Amino acid sequence: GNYADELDVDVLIVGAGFGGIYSLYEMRKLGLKAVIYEAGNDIGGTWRWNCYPGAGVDSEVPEYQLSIPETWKDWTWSTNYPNYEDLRKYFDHVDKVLDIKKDCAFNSVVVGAHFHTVEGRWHIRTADGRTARAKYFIIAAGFAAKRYIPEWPGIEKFKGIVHHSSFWPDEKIDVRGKRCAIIGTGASGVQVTQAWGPEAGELKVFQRTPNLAVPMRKRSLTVEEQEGAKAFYPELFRYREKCFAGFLYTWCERGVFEDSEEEREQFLEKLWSDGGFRYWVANYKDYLYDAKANRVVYDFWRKKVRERINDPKDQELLAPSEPPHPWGVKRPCLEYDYYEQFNRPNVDLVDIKDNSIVDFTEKGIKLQDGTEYEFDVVCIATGFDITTGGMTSMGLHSIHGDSLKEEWKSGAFTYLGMTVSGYPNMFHLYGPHGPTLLSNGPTTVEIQGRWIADAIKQMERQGIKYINPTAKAAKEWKAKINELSDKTLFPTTKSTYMGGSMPGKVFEQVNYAGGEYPYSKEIRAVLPNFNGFDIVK
């Protein structure tokens, strides 16, 4: 049925993660024939494929789920910060309540897409030779696309167990008493470090740049306290769409230097205590916008983290006097006992800032000054390539015949962070030029989801064949993306530290930095007239 060799649908969705599950939901309400092409065999996105030791949410319950009444009605969590196993069981519950799988074609890897302007339809080709033709094309393909491993020829030779964090196997590797390595101190590294520290015989963490990690206030939830709150879950889900990063909190109405030295200490203690990303996006409104303001947030962070690390050498490495970059310039890691792990005599932080990893060997890995380390298990928690999402990665072709990969070689150009000029009736959720990485995933998805479902609703009512963003509209959006980011302390091409900079492409801000509320207003302005689109009946 959904696996037919030439598939006729109104809507083709790529991905069965949050983005694809919510898009499918919205399409069913419009009464359109829709199908998800999913590369994998189950729904959940990153929560199925890209799981690793001690992986779980950094968003607090009930922030990280769908606002769909019927999905959370009889659902509760065991804890306020669930892990990947809890999330997997949540997606089973969403499938049991909505029957998502009925409209999925699994092991469907999209390798090509071209829009036939005369037909007014996408032809969407899978790796295994099937093709769907659809009026509307929705890409819920995620941002954790293109796992980044640096140029280490040796990996082939290494005798031990090695994987990138996002490719860690389902079947857990017993690391108890083994020599393990973690390369990277992003959320992935930090999460794995907390998981391996307690059990590994020896463990080495290879740190170029330290994580500016903030405390996770994890606790058990009862079914009772949750069922009690659900009176106002609807209001809560609406409140996150009013909040800068789409959590149940946003910026303090005050800037750093409206408060005294005592008032700051107390206010910052309160955010630290309360936990989550309050320190990141419930802090003084100007700390991401002014250097002196940033430094005050940094120093307090430095004080709190130093209290937890015994060795003065590790103290300096894990929380330096001089910031490696402005505080909160990248989504920090929500940690539980990261800093405690480096107090263990089996754990060892290695400074590679000036002494790069040259290559892997048979035994383990080797550095610039010729230092070698022998290992049994290595997790490569290096970056992703977020120059763009998995949008360039599925052979999307414009109506000018060029690939999106090609048209985006000098930098990404979307309109409203949901559409691309030369890709008519093509929509993306949780991708470039959306709140995306500066946001609660499910919040941004629902804002964007509702806009795509309205956009599609309007095209059906007004009798529109296709809409296509103008280069003028896309350039103006790019100008906006850059105007919001350039006010901030976010890295620029002139910055000494440019997190996730790559040889291939130029470095640029990829997310909308204006907040969920101003974003919602921007995208809402353009309906129902489709301002900035070529309209064809």
Ligand X SMILES: Cc1cc2nc3c(=O)[nH]c(=O)nc-3n(C[C@H](O)[C@H](O)[C@H](O)COP(=O)(O)OP(=O)(O)OC[C@H]3O[C@@H](n4cnc5c(N)ncnc54)[C@H](O)[C@@H]3O)c2cc1C
Ligand Y SMILES: NC(=O)c1ccc[n+]([C@@H]2O[C@H](COP(=O)([O-])OP(=O)(O)OC[C@H]3O[C@@H](n4cnc5c(N)ncnc54)[C@H](OP(=O)(O)O)[C@@H]3O)[C@@H](O)[C@H]2O)c1
Kindly state the tokens that stand for 358. 């040259």
Check the annotation: does 57 bind a ligand: no
Binding to ligand X by residue 441, rule CB under 6 A? yes
Q: Which of 315, 440, 468, 485 binds ligand X (CB under 6 A)?
A: 440
Q: Which of 11, 175, 182, 357 binds ligand Y (CB under 6 A)?
A: 357
Judged by DSSP in three states, 447 sits in helix
Q: Which residue is nearest to ligand X (CB)?
A: 45
Task: In whole angstroms, give the CA distance from residue 279 to residue 489.
Answer: 16
Of 417, 357, 367, 358, the closest CA to residue 391 belongs to: 417
Burial of 199 (0-12, 13-18, 19+ CB in 10 A): middle
Check the annotation: does 330 bind a ligand: yes
Check the annotation: does 506 bind a ligand: no
Neighbours of 356 (CB within 10 A): 13
The C-alpha angle 419, 14, 440, rounded to 5 degrees, equals 70
Q: Which of 110, 381, 438, 513 binds ligand Y (CB under 6 A)?
A: 381
Q: Please give the biggest Cα pair distance in the chain.
A: 70
Using an 8 Å Cβ cutoff, are 61 and 39 in contact? no
Residue 394, binding choice from ligand X, ligand Y, none, Cβ under 5 to 8 Å by partner class: ligand X
Residue 140, binding choice from ligand X, ligand Y, none, Cβ under 5 to 8 Å by partner class: ligand X
Residue 357, binding choice from ligand X, ligand Y, none, Cβ under 5 to 8 Å by partner class: ligand Y
Residue 184, binding choice from ligand X, ligand Y, none, Cβ under 5 to 8 Å by partner class: ligand Y
Check the annotation: does 110 bind a ligand: yes
Check the annotation: does 240 bind a ligand: no
Q: Which of 97, 173, 352, 399 binds ligand Y (CB under 6 A)?
A: 352
Check the annotation: does 430 bind a ligand: no
Task: In whole angstroms, give the CA distance from residue 407 to residue 398.
Answer: 9
Binding mask 61-100 for ligand X (x = CB under 6 A): ---x------------------------------------
Residue 323 or 515 having the CB closest to ligand X:
515
Residue 110, binding choice from ligand X, ligand Y, none, Cβ under 5 to 8 Å by partner class: ligand X
Binding to ligand Y by residue 82, rule CB under 6 A? no
Residue 80 or 315 having the CB closest to ligand X:
80
Burial of 176 (0-12, 13-18, 19+ CB in 10 A): exposed
Binding to ligand X by residue 40, rule CB under 6 A? yes
Residue 165, binding choice from ligand Y, ligand X, none, Cβ under 5 to 8 Å by partner class: ligand Y
Of 388, 399, 411, the closest CA to residue 137 belongs to: 399
Binding to ligand X by residue 333, rule CB under 6 A? no
Q: Which of 19, 62, 186, 197 binds ligand Y (CB under 6 A)?
A: 186
CA distances from 315 to 62, 149, 210, 213, 323 (A): 34, 28, 11, 14, 13
> Number of C-alpha atoms within 13 angstroms, CB side, residue 445?
27
Residue 225 or 351 having the CB closest to ligand Y:
351
Burial of 133 (0-12, 13-18, 19+ CB in 10 A): middle
- Number of residues located near ligand X, criterion CB under 6 A: 33
Residue 37 or 158 having the CB closest to ligand X:
37
Using an 8 Å Cβ cutoff, are 309 and 318 in contact? yes
Residue 247 or 530 having the CB closest to ligand Y:
247
Q: What is the CA radius of gyration of the chain?
A: 23
Binding to ligand X by residue 58, rule CB under 6 A? yes
> Number of C-alpha atoms within 13 angstroms, CB side, residue 443?
32
Kindly state the tokens that stand for 177. 């008493």
Residue 338 per-residue DSSP state:
H
Of 451, 426, 457, 468, the closest CA to residue 124 belongs to: 426
Binding to ligand X by residue 2, rule CB under 6 A? no
Q: Which of 7, 12, 17, 98 binds ligand X (CB under 6 A)?
A: 17
Binding mask 207-226 for ligand Y (x = CB under 6 A): -xx-----------------
Residue 390, binding choice from ligand Y, ligand X, none, Cβ under 5 to 8 Å by partner class: ligand X
Using an 8 Å Cβ cutoff, are 133 and 7 in contact? yes
Of 220, 219, 217, the closest CA to residue 270 belongs to: 217
Binding to ligand Y by residue 162, rule CB under 6 A? no
Residue 45, binding choice from ligand X, ligand Y, none, Cβ under 5 to 8 Å by partner class: ligand X
Q: Which of 26, 38, 335, 407 binds ligand X (CB under 6 A)?
A: 38
Of 36, 12, 103, 32, the closest CA to residue 427 belongs to: 12
> What residues are designated binding site?
19, 38, 46, 49, 52, 58-59, 64, 110, 185, 187-188, 208-209, 330-331, 441, 497
Footprint on this chain of ligand Y (rule: CB under 6 A): 58, 144, 150, 165, 183-189, 191, 208-209, 330-331, 352, 357, 381-384, 437, 499-500
The residues of the shown chain that bind ligand X, judged by CB under 6 A, are 14-20, 37-40, 45-46, 49-50, 55, 57-59, 64, 108-110, 140-142, 144, 390, 394, 429-430, 440-441
